[PDB]
């Protein structure tokens, strides 16, 4: 893509400590997949394109940019250690929309849309066995 997007967030690094356990498996198998399949996931299943978007200021705000496209890659690959680095991403990837766009944009319903399922599904998170 365009030199004046960033690289996507590392979904691969052999230096990072990595591990499966039950919660990152139902990070998978039931969060992603709950949110993937949503009407409203469109908007977030790969990195914001500030240039397609003409948001030339998306990346001079958001400086920590996530989407669920990288969340995917990395529950895929088994980028992460523990289920906090995952959630933290989807959290960001939340926090960030929140941040850029005014409140009642669609955007911002969209993401609140996932968000309320997100959490229903992370209070629910498998004790860590
Ligand atoms: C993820 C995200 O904020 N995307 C986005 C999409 C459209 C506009 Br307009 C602003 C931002």
Redesign the pocket.
């Known amino acids: 893509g365009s030199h004046m997007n960033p690289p996507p967030p590392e979904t691969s690094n052999p230096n990072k400590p990595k591990r499966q356990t039950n919660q990152l498996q139902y990070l998978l198998r039931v969060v992603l997949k709950t949110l993937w399949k949503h009407q409203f996931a469109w908007?977030?299943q790969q990195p914001?394109d500030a240039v397609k978007?003409n948001?030339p200021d998306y990346y001079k705000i958001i400086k920590t940019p996530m989407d669920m496209g990288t969340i995917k890659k990395r529950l895929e690959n088994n980028y992460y250690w523990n289920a906090q680095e995952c959630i933290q991403d989807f959290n960001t990837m939340f926090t960030?929309?929140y941040i850029?766009?005014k409140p009642g944009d669609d955007?911002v319903l969209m993401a609140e849309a996932l968000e309320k399922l997100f959490l229903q599904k992370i209070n629910e998170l498998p004790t860590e066995e």
Do not use: A, E, R
Request: charged share 0%; glycine share 0%; with cysteine.
């Open positions: 908007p977030f914001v978007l948001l960030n929309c850029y766009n955007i």
